[PDB]
Design a binder for these strands. Structure first.
Ligand SMILES: O=C(N[C@H](CO)[C@H](O)c1ccc([N+](=O)[O-])cc1)C(Cl)Cl
Ligand SMILES: [K+]
Ligand SMILES: [K+]
Ligand SMILES: [K+]
Ligand SMILES: [K+]
Ligand SMILES: [K+]
Ligand SMILES: [K+]
Ligand SMILES: [K+]
Ligand SMILES: [K+]
Ligand SMILES: [K+]
Ligand SMILES: [K+]
Ligand SMILES: [K+]
Ligand SMILES: [K+]
Ligand SMILES: [Mg+2]
Ligand SMILES: [Mg+2]
Ligand SMILES: [Mg+2]
Ligand SMILES: [Mg+2]
Ligand SMILES: [Mg+2]
Ligand SMILES: [Mg+2]
Ligand SMILES: [Mg+2]
Ligand SMILES: [Mg+2]
Ligand SMILES: [Mg+2]
Ligand SMILES: [Mg+2]
Ligand SMILES: [Mg+2]
Ligand SMILES: [Mg+2]
Ligand SMILES: [Mg+2]
Ligand SMILES: [Mg+2]
Ligand SMILES: [Mg+2]
Ligand SMILES: [Mg+2]
Ligand SMILES: [Mg+2]
Ligand SMILES: [Mg+2]
Ligand SMILES: [Mg+2]
Ligand SMILES: [Mg+2]
Ligand SMILES: [Mg+2]
Ligand SMILES: [Mg+2]
Ligand SMILES: [Mg+2]
Ligand SMILES: [Mg+2]
Ligand SMILES: [Mg+2]
Ligand SMILES: [Mg+2]
Ligand SMILES: [Mg+2]
Ligand SMILES: [Mg+2]
Ligand SMILES: [Mg+2]
Ligand SMILES: [Mg+2]
Ligand SMILES: [Mg+2]
Ligand SMILES: [Mg+2]
Ligand SMILES: [Mg+2]
Ligand SMILES: [Mg+2]
Ligand SMILES: [Mg+2]
Ligand SMILES: [Mg+2]
Ligand SMILES: [Mg+2]
Ligand SMILES: [Mg+2]
Ligand SMILES: [Mg+2]
Ligand SMILES: [Mg+2]
Ligand SMILES: [Mg+2]
Ligand SMILES: [Mg+2]
Ligand SMILES: [Mg+2]
Ligand SMILES: [Mg+2]
Ligand SMILES: [Mg+2]
Ligand SMILES: [Mg+2]
Ligand SMILES: [Mg+2]
Ligand SMILES: [Mg+2]
Ligand SMILES: [Zn+2]
Lengths: 151, 190, 49, 111, 127, 4, 51
RNA sequence: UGACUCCCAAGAGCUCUUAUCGACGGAGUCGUUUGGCACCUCGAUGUCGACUCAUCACAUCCUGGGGUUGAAGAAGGUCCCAAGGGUUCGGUUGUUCGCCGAUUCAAGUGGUACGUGAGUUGGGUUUAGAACGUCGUGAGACAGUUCGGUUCCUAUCUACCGUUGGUGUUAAAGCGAGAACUGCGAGGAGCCAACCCUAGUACGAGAGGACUGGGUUGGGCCAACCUAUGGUGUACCGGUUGUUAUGACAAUAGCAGCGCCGGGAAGCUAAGUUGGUAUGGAAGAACUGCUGCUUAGCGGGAAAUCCUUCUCUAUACAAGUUCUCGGAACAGGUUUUAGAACAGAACUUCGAUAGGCGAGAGGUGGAAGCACCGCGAGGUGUGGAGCCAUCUCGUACUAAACGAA
RNA sequence: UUCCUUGUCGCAUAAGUAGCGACCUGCACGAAUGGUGUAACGACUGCCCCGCUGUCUCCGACAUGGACCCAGUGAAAUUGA
């Protein structure tokens, strides 16, 4: 994974990310720059996974990251009920406009599968069990193909 | 994956679609028809080959990395010229900088050839070849293997024009072939 | 270092030649809200959102 | 990705092939080991090395481990590849309790 | 790397105990294990074959920089130590006569490859 | 003498 | 490179270099050089032109 | 004046002028020494030495080929040919120079504003302070000594190192594009030592001791690579100090500019690991011989010259060749082995390109909760436990053609 | 304070135009423009030794701010063409 620096040192960067994730959980949709959203979505999914686990150690690890009591309660009750059957990808990021003043490309980022979302998301599907992969050579034998007849 | 001109080129030649193309000069008695499939048994274990590939990229780099310059001292009064090149010519005769002067610029990601690299092992079931040492390029990229020009192999042992594998062959019965080292121990006659 | 001579209009125009703007090949407008936008820009979601 | 997968398959097969021919026990830091080492540079001379494992690395066929011992009053550290064929015999004698995975403080500690 | 200014302990009975290296005989960066160095005697026993201030030859038998072998093994001692050999006969660029008669402490395996056979023979512990 |  | 080596390598370049340095130095020089066709042998393609 | 070359040859060389030299005297070459002149520059051309970076000449220091010897062999002397590649680290000195020490195949002589300060330094000389010796009545002076003393500039043009955009190269769709090449031409690479066999052979009274030919090990330089080793590894694992907050317990979070310690996978890198330091052809330098008979013809002949191996190259304007497409190629989005922008390469929904999720490898080192032992700090079990920087595999849940575009 | 001069000898170093101690041939020392010493003191000027280190052999990785790129605002010396 490419981890961005965002023009900040470590403490400022991590405090800004924790504030952004807390505000995303609180307001259910925020508009920010695209480069910040591309870093937010990973941690916003990690907190939902901690809430889906819901043990005491997960509660402690999530309280060591997010800010607020409304945030921790919402993650550990409402999101654990909502995203129970979904595997991953609880957030949607969409580019919207260009900011006057510094020409920054802006984007909505929101939690999915709720009322008043930007797009109708796919239904939650359980993952099929792990399949034993083929060898690269056995796959290369099956990957051989000819040009389609059109000319 | 292919554009329309390459799709048409493959469809006209009557071959399956490929990823990378290369052209090798041969003589008249070493030609092969269109559609011949070439394997690892084209090479014999124990011989030397030449590998050509695109080397690893370093980007824009300075003189101290590019050309192993010495630079300036880190102390003793030196000011803002720690890793610079120094002089770039003489004064007034010539009054110009000579061509080929070593200066910073883009480094690497060019084509290079490694000579006399040794074939150790051959696995024809999986079409793998174990070659001793280093090979220019990144992992996941393409290299091109010819015979060595410096240590030329034996004429009577190489398959010509290539190894013609029988069509009645199965990959179940193929064992990997190791290059013979002989019998006289190197570490004992010392 | 200072400029040795004055840059003429010919050289100034040649320098500023390649930096002129160019038109955009593809332009999308939403049929409902009527916003003129580039590809991959979100303006409206349809009804029964 | 396919190239790294190929490399992992090759390493797994090499390790499994060696493990059916030789008996190589699990080596951990803090263990006391005694092994028989043949040096091919010095006319294939075979000797016995006894020491304490202070470092380990798991890298497939190229796993390594470090031994610190005292010979004739002077401390010698030697590193051996685990699956090297010049390790004729390997035995574990004692398992001292440590709280680290690398025991590099033994160089300066007096005993 | 053993280079100009290194101070090395002496591990025979030649009468000297510490030396200061001047240069290595072959090699630009310095001397590795088994290499031959030129040195000057900094401290010596009151009775011995080598006096303080003499210029001597030596063979590095212990070095604190790790050395690799052809099977992928490494060896690393704790200090630097040499065994002095004679330098009055400069026509022999091969195995030299050691000055002393006894060699103390461990000796490396590299001396067979470097043709230090007499030091290897007079050795007691080889490690 | 001369001095800059 | 000596004249012997030049004649062994390519003989038409000798006549081309001899004529090129007697032609005047201006922008018509290559236009007039384009009209000089030199052949090593006695066979030329311009057989149907009014020679 | 200096350096170098040549002419004559008394004499030295046991004999013998010219192997090696060479008195008394002459003829030149070069532009590096010491000088002469005062032609350019005083509305400024920054001066010694060192560092970094070089490049040219050959009057050659080493390596290569030869003639002669007062050359038995080894080691040599002298002269001719040869500029492909090299030509060390330190002590006192500001030093150039030079002396010394340890090496080396050798530690060349000169030019390039005694190369190089809009590339670095500032020890000396050469401003203003102060002192010693000497000179001067004195103010002061002294290529006599000594301590101290501001080194500016954002690159317009030529030059050079890299990367791109446009455009000429009739084609038949006023034609526009994707690949695969040939190479006119240009660049790069060019080394050396030690030991062993031939051989204790040739030669020599003996002591000594080869040519040629073939291997082995090292050093220098050049091109690449990251499996292992070492270093780093600032959003990984643990330990711990001061303080503040969550009321306290329990567990954490901020700050001490990674708080400080012990490890650390990928990535980068050398101190690490690999590959080269060739072969064949042509023409030929000093020299060397053959035919002929005065004019010449021919053969052998070097680390040198030109092709061959490596890299770039059709803007190579006589503008090259082959295959293919015609809603073709582009653009936009997700990225990366690539990267300053640009460009390249992978994927773009009949899709694993990125994120998420699940499993495993790898790192750290034994989580929380519970129970037992102890007054307590603490110790033991459940348990190779818990956690996650990376890597691989499975999976369209999210974003890439959600383009009913 | 000594031109000749890196004077000569000793200590010290592998090697010392330096440093210390001698010698006297003092170009051109010398007694309140003070002579010879001197415990303590010095951001003064030399020399030697220990500990320590990227000053160096020989450089590498990482971290913050510029440099790079996009959107606003927008100088300077210089200039016969
Ligand atoms: O005057 C100077 N230079 C003049 C002209 O600029 C000339 O270059 C020069 C330089 C050095 C010099 N000298 O060393 O005696 C004399 C004149 C410098 Cl002071 Cl800038
Ligand atoms: K002037
Ligand atoms: K010679
Ligand atoms: K000779
Ligand atoms: K300068
Ligand atoms: K200038
Ligand atoms: K100009
Ligand atoms: K590493
Ligand atoms: K921590
Ligand atoms: K503070
Ligand atoms: K005086
Ligand atoms: K006094
Ligand atoms: K003071
Ligand atoms: Mg910024
Ligand atoms: Mg902090
Ligand atoms: Mg250097
Ligand atoms: Mg440096
Ligand atoms: Mg600085
Ligand atoms: Mg400054
Ligand atoms: Mg890799
Ligand atoms: Mg033309
Ligand atoms: Mg006049
Ligand atoms: Mg002027
Ligand atoms: Mg001026
Ligand atoms: Mg000559
Ligand atoms: Mg001889
Ligand atoms: Mg030269
Ligand atoms: Mg000193
Ligand atoms: Mg010096
Ligand atoms: Mg100069
Ligand atoms: Mg010069
Ligand atoms: Mg200059
Ligand atoms: Mg500057
Ligand atoms: Mg000064
Ligand atoms: Mg001064
Ligand atoms: Mg400056
Ligand atoms: Mg060519
Ligand atoms: Mg390199
Ligand atoms: Mg590595
Ligand atoms: Mg690795
Ligand atoms: Mg490591
Ligand atoms: Mg507590
Ligand atoms: Mg705080
Ligand atoms: Mg750390
Ligand atoms: Mg570490
Ligand atoms: Mg001839
Ligand atoms: Mg010939
Ligand atoms: Mg063209
Ligand atoms: Mg495209
Ligand atoms: Mg890009
Ligand atoms: Mg994926
Ligand atoms: Mg593990
Ligand atoms: Mg814990
Ligand atoms: Mg003096
Ligand atoms: Mg002396
Ligand atoms: Mg001094
Ligand atoms: Mg004195
Ligand atoms: Mg008086
Ligand atoms: Mg007086
Ligand atoms: Mg007084
Ligand atoms: Mg700029
Ligand atoms: Zn709209």
């Amino acid at each position: 994974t490419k981890l961005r620096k965002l023009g900040r040192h470590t403490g400022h960067r991590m405090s800004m990310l924790r504030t952004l994730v807390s505000q995303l959980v609180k307001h259910e949709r925020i508009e920010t720059t695209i480069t910040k959203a591309k870093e937010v979505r990973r941690l916003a999914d990690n907190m939902v996974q901690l809430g889906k686990e819901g043990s005491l150690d997960a509660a402690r690890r999530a309280a060591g990251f997010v800010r607020g009591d409304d945030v921790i309660h919402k993650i550990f009750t409402e999101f654990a009920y909502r995203y129970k059957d979904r595997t991953g990808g609880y957030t949607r990021m969409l580019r919207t406009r260009i900011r006057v003043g510094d020409a920054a490309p802006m984007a909505y980022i929101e939690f999915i599968d709720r009322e008043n979302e930007l797009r109708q998301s796919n239904p939650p599907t359980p993952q099929p069990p792990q399949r034993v992969p083929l060898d690269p050579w056995a796959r290369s034998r099956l990957m051989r193909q000819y040009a389609p007849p059109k000319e | 994956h292919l554009t329309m001109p390459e799709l048409g080129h493959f469809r006209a030649q009557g071959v399956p679609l490929k990823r990378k193309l290369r052209e090798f000069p041969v003589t008249e008695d070493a030609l092969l028809p269109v559609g011949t499939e070439l394997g690892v048994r084209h090479f014999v274990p124990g011989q030397y080959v030449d590998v050509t590939g695109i080397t690893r990229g370093k980007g824009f780099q300075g003189v101290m990395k590019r050309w192993k310059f010495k630079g300036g001292p880190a102390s003793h009064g030196c000011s803002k010229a720690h890793r610079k090149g120094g002089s770039t010519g003489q004064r007034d005769d010539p009054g110009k900088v000579f061509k080929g002067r070593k200066m910073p610029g883009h480094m690497g990601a060019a084509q290079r050839t490694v000579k006399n690299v040794w074939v150790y092992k051959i696995d024809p079931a999986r079409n793998l070849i174990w070659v001793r040492g280093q090979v220019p390029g990144a992992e996941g990229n393409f290299v091109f293997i010819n015979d060595a020009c410096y240590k030329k192999p034996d004429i009577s042992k190489l398959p010509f024009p290539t190894y013609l594998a029988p069509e009645d062959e199965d990959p179940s019965e193929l064992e990997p072939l190791v290059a013979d080292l002989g019998e006289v121990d190197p570490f004992m006659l010392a | 270092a200072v400029p040795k001579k004055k840059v003429s209009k010919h050289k100034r125009g040649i320098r500023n030649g390649p930096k002129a703007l160019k038109p955009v090949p593809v332009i999308i407008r939403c049929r409902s809200c009527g916003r003129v936008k580039l590809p991959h820009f979100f303006c409206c979601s349809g009804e029964r959102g | 990705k396919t190239a790294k997968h190929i490399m992992q398959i090759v390493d797994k097969e090499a390790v499994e092939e060696v493990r059916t021919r030789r008996e190589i026990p699990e080596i951990r830091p803090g263990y006391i080991v005694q092994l028989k080492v043949e040096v091919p540079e010095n006319k294939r001379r075979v000797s016995i090395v006894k020491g304490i494992v202070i470092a380990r690395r798991n890298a497939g066929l190229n796993s390594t481990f470090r031994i610190r011992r005292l010979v004739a009053g002077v401390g010698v550290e030697s590193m051996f590849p685990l699956y090297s064929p010049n390790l004729r015999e390997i035995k574990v004698l004692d398992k001292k309790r440590v709280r680290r995975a690398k025991l590099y403080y033994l160089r300066d500690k007096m005993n | 790397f053993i280079q100009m200014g290194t101070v090395l302990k002496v591990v025979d009975n030649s009468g000297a105990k510490k030396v200061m290296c001047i240069q290595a005989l072959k090699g630009k960066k310095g001397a590795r294990l088994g290499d031959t160095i030129v040195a000057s005697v900094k401290e010596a026993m009151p009775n011995g074959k080598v006096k303080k201030g003499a210029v001597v030859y030596g063979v590095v038998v212990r070095a604190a920089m790790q050395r690799g072998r052809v099977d992928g093994s490494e060896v690393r001692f704790d200090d630097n130590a040499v065994v002095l050999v004679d330098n009055k006969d400069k026509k022999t660029k091969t195995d030299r006569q050691p000055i002393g008669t006894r060699v103390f402490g461990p000796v490396p395996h590299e001396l067979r490859k470097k043709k230090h056979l007499k030091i290897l023979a007079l050795a007691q512990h080889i490690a | 003498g001369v001095a800059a | 490179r000596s004249l012997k080596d030049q004649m062994a390598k390519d003989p038409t370049e000798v006549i081309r270099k001899a004529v090129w340095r007697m032609l005047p130095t201006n922008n018509l020089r290559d236009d007039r050089d384009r009209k000089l066709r030199i052949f090593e042998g006695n066979e030329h393609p311009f057989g149907d032109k009014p020679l």
